[PDB]
Amino acid sequence: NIKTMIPGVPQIDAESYILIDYNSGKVLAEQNADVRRDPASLTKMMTSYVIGQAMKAGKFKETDLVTIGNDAWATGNPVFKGSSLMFLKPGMQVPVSQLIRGINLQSGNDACVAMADFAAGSQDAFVGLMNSYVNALGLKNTHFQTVHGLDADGQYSSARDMALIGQALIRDVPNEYSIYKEKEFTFNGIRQLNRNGLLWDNSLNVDGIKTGHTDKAGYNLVASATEGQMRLISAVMGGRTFKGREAESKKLLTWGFRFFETVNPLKVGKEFASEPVWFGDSDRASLGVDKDVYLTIPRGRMKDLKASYVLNSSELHAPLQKNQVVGTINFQLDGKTIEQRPLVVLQEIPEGNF
């Protein structure tokens, strides 16, 4: 009963939450995780993601100077009233490094317009890109309308999608992601503190991601944390109270690390299985995966993990292409299959030539 226990999830005082394993993508806990909600400042995670995808493609550098236009003039645009700001003025020339820190650390909305026109030529075009990446990551409950998330009556996202946005940030744009852990940065003689106060929590290894609050939206946080071979990501949306912002998230992460652990049973290219092949330049095919397998399993249960496979066809016939799917690897715990991955041919086997 102890071996096969399922941990109860704690009460979370928020309208929605999810908790995923970053490597495996396993959902450990969820409530209302697809309901569409105002993402407030969590919108700047996608802003960040586009920018980081542009810098990864070499379009521009941290040291490049961005010239501030009228549209990014903090006190020239009452849409910015009450919101986090760098206090950019036109004709300023700010390094990219300083503007993307404004966005990330500070959620400065003025810095969002500066960076959108710089990377994409207009805000409208940049939002084009934001929604393109919403399509490419396969999010079913997310839509953006503005670069900052202000003035967007018809923008939305969800706990799940915002978690998946964090996974993508981490996975796809790691130099962009590694800015979120920075506790402070300085612009124009003022020091600016990162608003993610879980960074200062000495029990966990928090290094991201994004905080957010409006009266309509409540308190939002997307956090990520590590414990050696394990990274978790939580999205809490509509946090109902102040301070509970960080606390409810801390609950979820701590719980996930106490009750679960992530394992890597098999990496790309490593032979899991071997089967006879007909008509080849070799008598046998090497079978494995085309992508490292990460599984989230109850903590401590690595020793009981079993793996077996099934095959689609009675016989393999050459030519076999690289990463041709020939079957399925089953990972089992207590005699029940918990996870499945495709079985693929690791190395091409063309028809025999003599």
Swiss-Prot record:
Substrate binds at residue 210. The active site is at 41 (acyl-ester intermediate), 44 (proton acceptor), 107. It is found in: Cell inner membrane. GO terms for biological process: cell division; cell wall organization; peptidoglycan biosynthetic process; peptidoglycan metabolic process; proteolysis; regulation of cell shape. It catalyses: Preferential cleavage: (Ac)2-L-Lys-D-Ala-|-D-Ala. Also transpeptidation of peptidyl-alanyl moieties that are N-acyl substituents of D-alanine; a beta-lactam + H2O = a substituted beta-amino acid. It is a peripheral membrane protein. Its EC number is 3.4.16.4, 3.5.2.6. GO terms for cellular component: outer membrane-bounded periplasmic space; plasma membrane. It comes from the Bacteria. Belongs to the peptidase S11 family. This is D-alanyl-D-alanine carboxypeptidase DacA. It comes from Escherichia coli (strain K12). The gene is dacA.
